[PDB]
């Protein structure tokens, strides 16, 4: 019967995504261009005896441009290109699966120099288990067919097998070997020089003011977006136009991008405030505790917008600028705990009445006091011992140590938080006038600029860095260098 | 359907027996299989039943398919190949019918090799449901016609899979797949012979000899299979023509090794001048600690250029051995703790770096206390310790034992910790030298360590010619027996 078709389209549509659209992942797009550089100019490589590399895996967190980097190859390489998804092989029969990979490559041999792309390969790339559940056997037959066809008998050349997944750890080591997938490319979330070039790709079809050059704005916008990815930048460019045209404006201001950031980080800003003046006053004194403690602690994040207008599932928010770091020390993690506890401390100093509104502040202080002790080794008494924590979605099934150790751990979380708590109480009790100044201004303007904090408290007394040019002081290059090697100068 | 989807291939494949080169004691036993087809006399002189074939087993990337390619080219007999997954079809009755057509194809080309790659797609544990009864009748069809070769004189059937455990024990009876040629990962004698196959089509530098380098590349690459060796000889050619270089030099091979196990050498990453100073003082603490412990692995390359999931790395030369003493495990804990100690002496602050260092200190010391007999107070017991990632169901011991275990692991780690703090404080100026040279060069080799610290004070082993003196042959040998005079 005619269920033997590969359901893979030989991509004939001219995709208009060149390699100039794929920014950020600079050293990852170089190793995809060498697939194109080989098929277009084989003389540079065949004079050194270099065979064609067989394939590649594109790994990374989701939303990083490992499908977009495959879209660039379709629109640039002049070879035939076909696409297929990793969950298209299995259907409701026994032969289908293995009889569908065999016609994926028999199609890919009729197109002799072609490149094929398997998206979400972890649907048929799962590691083979023992004699087990009956649905697992059909996945192993489809995988074992895929392994023979990529490296074995009747394995042709000139077929580059690109592949993409975001769970490479569940993959079979028979796929991960060279000869099947010669390169494993990890496309991680880019840094600030990478995000600044992803803004340059997507600010390009917008319409900015007579001011706001698209080059200097991309440096500003990557500063305000720490920790984003290749697709989180794509909404901030997009949804700032949908805010610019909701108010029926002619060109996108800078004030429309910041309302596109805070919508994605925060949530729906509710227009009708509903709180009574005795419970808007409590949220105001609470959000001033996040403001002032974050303002007077070194290693705390810079402040952008304290607002008691309800947003998302909260009654207020703080809008910090998280320092895009890779190594947290012990004192940097304490001043997040001494800041996240800062809201309840300001309630307790002014009112004397703890509330239930600090529930999400305490869950953060809990999880950043267990990960320091169990997961990290920040505690002298437990020791230099690291474990694995169960996540929130993960379910706590059995604790992997003794209850006499868990008695020791919980006695040390309680000392760690109380040391973080007494520091904040001894911080907001001499700055009691400064918390008073912030939250009274919150009860009229209902938001605060960072400039409003400067007009009220003064300059922040710590070595604060906020702009792009003072985040990229260290590398000394000021821009993501898209310089090509000498064998890659056909682009 | 009924179509056998096999290909009678007589093509002049460029795979010879000179292309296998390192699975030599596994090489002669398939030369014996060609001897069965060409000479049915000298194995019937003693009344020996000529076996039907072997199953090529081993880790992935080793040679269990290439050695079947070399049988097709070297032996003048015709060759037919399938995979195991090509037999199961939609309709019930095709799977136990293609195996007729495969084994009837082997009669029309009667003296023949017949290879079934990935045989664990057919050979499985039998069972039930009709989807499981299909591969039951397929595997029974394989066993019937396997035994039915008494009428023919010469049909041999190879097989290759990387999972021999899932195979049905009905395949392993006499008159069936008798031998199990285990094709395993080579030692450094056989691995240098693998580099000589793949240094051959390269246009190398004129100041490099293709045998003095194949011994050097086998020295720098321990634990690799036959696929990781063929990749380094291919990646270093792709690294060469990336820069439009005239010929491949030694620096290109040292990066292709560094590419495979390291990650992606990326320069566009931004790091503050304080967060490079923390990483450089970190991984000098791994470098000096492995330099001064007797049973630590010798240092190979330390760099702070980011590689995917890491800010820096320290490539080592793992001593490929089978037994670990109690202090050979102590010097690895004292080295893995070494980066965190050096952050404490130079700074006084403790980072979330060396999180993956502290995992290895835990999962060694748990395995050392629990599932060996390395502790006198816990005793001579061994427990099936559940691996990380899998769920832990219920402990096989008491809570009072787990209190005794977790109090001794804490003693074991602090004994590894105090030894490293005593090591990297006496040697404090030597960690200062190694780190500042990483702070300006960002990659250090072992040659940069010898020029900076002097020679290592221990009778180390790094050269290929001192790796090989344990036997005395001084080179890997390829010779034939007296009963194999046709190859």
């Amino acid at each position: 019967f005619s269920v033997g078709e590969t359901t893979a389209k030989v991509l004939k549509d001219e995709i208009d995504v060149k390699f100039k659209d794929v920014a950020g992942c600079e050293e990852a797009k170089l190793e995809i261009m060498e697939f194109v550089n080989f098929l277009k100019n084989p003389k540079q490589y065949q004079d050194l005896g270099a065979k064609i590399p067989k394939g590649a895996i594109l790994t990374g967190p989701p939303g990083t441009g490992k499908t977009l980097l495959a879209k660039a190859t379709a629109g640039e390489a002049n070879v035939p290109f076909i696409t297929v998804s990793g969950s298209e092989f299995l259907e409701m029969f026994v032969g289908v699966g293995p009889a569908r990979v065999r016609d994926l490559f028999a199609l890919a041999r009729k197109n002799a120099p072609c490149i094929l792309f398997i998206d979400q390969i972890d649907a048929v790339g799962r590691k083979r288990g023992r004699g087990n559940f009956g649905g697992q056997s059909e996945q192993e037959n489809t995988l074992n067919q895929l392994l023979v066809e990529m490296d074995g008998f009747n394995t042709t050349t000139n077929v580059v097998i690109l592949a993409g997944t975001n769970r490479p750890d569940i993959l079979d080591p028979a796929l991960l070997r060279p000869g099947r997938f010669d390169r494993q490319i990890f496309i991680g979330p880019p840094d600030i020089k990478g995000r600044a070039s992803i803004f340059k790709v997507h600010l390009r079809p917008l319409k900015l003011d007579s001011t706001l050059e698209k080059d200097k704005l991309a440096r500003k916008l990557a500063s305000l977006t720490p920790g984003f990815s290749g697709a989180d930048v794509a909404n901030v460019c997009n949804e700032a136009a949908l805010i610019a045209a909701r108010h029926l404006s002619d060109s996108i201001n800078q004030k429309h991008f910041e309302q596109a950031i805070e919508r994605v980080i925060g949530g729906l800003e509710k227009k009708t405030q509903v709180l009574q003046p005795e419970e808007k006053k409590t949220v105001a004194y609470h959000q001033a505790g996040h403001a002032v403690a974050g303002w007077y602690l070194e290693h705390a994040d810079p402040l952008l917008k304290v607002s008691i207008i309800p947003r998302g599932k909260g009654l207020g928010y703080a809008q910090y600028l998280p320092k895009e770091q890779y190594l947290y020390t012990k004192e940097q993690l304490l001043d997040r705990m001494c800041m996240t506890l800062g809201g309840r401390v300001s309630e307790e100093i002014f009112f004397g009445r703890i509330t239930t509104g600090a529930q999400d502040d305490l869950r953060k202080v809990t999880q950043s006091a267990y990960a320091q002790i169990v997961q990290f080794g920040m505690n002298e008494k437990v020791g230099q011992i690291s474990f694995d924590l169960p996540r929130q979605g993960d379910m706590v099934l059995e604790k992997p140590y003794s209850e006499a150790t868990a008695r020791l751990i919980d006695d040390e979380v309680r000392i760690l938080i109380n040391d973080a708590y007494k520091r904040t109480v001894a911080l907001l009790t001499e700055k009691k006038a400064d918390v008073e100044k912030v939250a009274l201004l919150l009860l009229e303007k209902e938001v605060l600029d960072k400039n409003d904090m400067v007009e009220l408290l003064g300059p922040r007394p710590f070595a604060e860095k906020s702009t792009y040019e003072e985040f990229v002081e260290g590398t000394g290059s000021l821009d993501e260098d898209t310089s090509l090697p000498e064998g890659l100068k056909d682009w | 359907v009924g179509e056998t989807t096999a290909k009678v291939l007589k093509d002049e494949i460029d795979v010879k027996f000179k292309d296998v080169a390192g699975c030599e004691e596994a090489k002669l036993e398939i030369m014996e299989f060609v001897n069965f087809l060409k000479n049915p006399k000298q194995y019937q002189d003693l009344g020996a039943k000529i076996p039907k074939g072997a199953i090529l087993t081993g880790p992935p990337g080793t040679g269990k398919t290439l050695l079947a390619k070399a049988t097709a080219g070297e032996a003048n007999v015709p060759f037919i190949t399938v995979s195991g997954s090509e037999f199961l079809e939609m309709f019930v009755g095709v799977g136990p019918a293609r195996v007729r057509d495969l084994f009837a194809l082997a009669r029309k080309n009667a003296p023949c090799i017949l290879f079934i790659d990935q045989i664990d797609a057919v050979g499985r544990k039998r069972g039930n449901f009709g989807g499981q009864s299909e591969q039951e009748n397929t595997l029974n069809q394989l066993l019937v016609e396997m035994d039915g070769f008494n009428t023919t004189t010469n049909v041999v059937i190879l097989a290759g899979t990387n999972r021999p455990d899932i195979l049905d024990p009905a395949l392993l009876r006499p008159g069936r797949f008798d031998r199990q040629i285990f094709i395993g990962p080579p030692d450094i004698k056989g691995r240098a012979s693998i580099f000589k196959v793949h240094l051959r089509p390269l246009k190398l530098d004129s100041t490099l000899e293709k045998d003095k380098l194949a011994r050097k590349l086998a020295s720098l690459t321990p634990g690799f299979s036959g696929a990781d060796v063929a990749n380094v000889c291919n990646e270093a050619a792709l690294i060469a023509a990336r820069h439009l270089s005239d010929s491949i030099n030694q620096k290109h091979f040292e990066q292709a090794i560094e590419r495979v196990i390291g990650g992606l050498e990326k320069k566009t990453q931004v790091l503050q001048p304080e967060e490079k100073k923390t990483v450089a003082y970190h991984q000098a603490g791994h470098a000096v600690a492995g330099w001064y412990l007797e049973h630590a692995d010798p240092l190979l390359k330390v760099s702070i250029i980011p590689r995917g999931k890491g800010l820096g790395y320290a490539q080592y030369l793992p001593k490929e051995q089978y037994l670990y003493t109690k202090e050979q495990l102590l010097d690895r804990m004292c080295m893995t703790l070494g980066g965190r100690v050096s952050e404490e002496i130079f700074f006084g602050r403790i980072t979330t770096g060396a999180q993956d260092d502290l995992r290895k200190v835990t999962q060694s010391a748990y395995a050392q206390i629990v599932q060996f007999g390395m502790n006198e107070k816990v005793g001579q017991i061994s427990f099936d310790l559940p691996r990380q990632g899998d769920m832990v169901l219920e402990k096989p011991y008491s809570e009072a034992t787990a209190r005794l275990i977790d109090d001794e692991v804490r003693i074991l780690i602090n004994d590894a910790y105090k030894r490293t703090v005593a090591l990297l404080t006496e040697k404090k100026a030597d960690v200062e030298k190694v780190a500042l040279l990483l702070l300006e060069k960002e990659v250090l080799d072992k040659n940069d360590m010898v020029e900076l610290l002097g020679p290592r004070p221990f009778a180390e082993k790094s050269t290929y010619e001192e790796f090989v003196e344990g036997t005395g042959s001084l080179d890997e040998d390829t010779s034939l027996p007296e009963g194999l005079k046709d190859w």
Binding site: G227, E324, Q325, Y326, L327, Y328 | T221, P222, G223, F224, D228, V260, I261, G262, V279, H282, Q283, H286, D297, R307, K309, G310, L311, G312, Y313, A314, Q315, Y316, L317, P318, T336, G339, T352, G353, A354, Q355, D356, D357
Partner: peptide, 11 residues
Amino acid sequence: AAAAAAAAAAA
């Protein structure tokens, strides 16, 4: 593969 012994990221 072989021994890598990296310094991982925590962000």
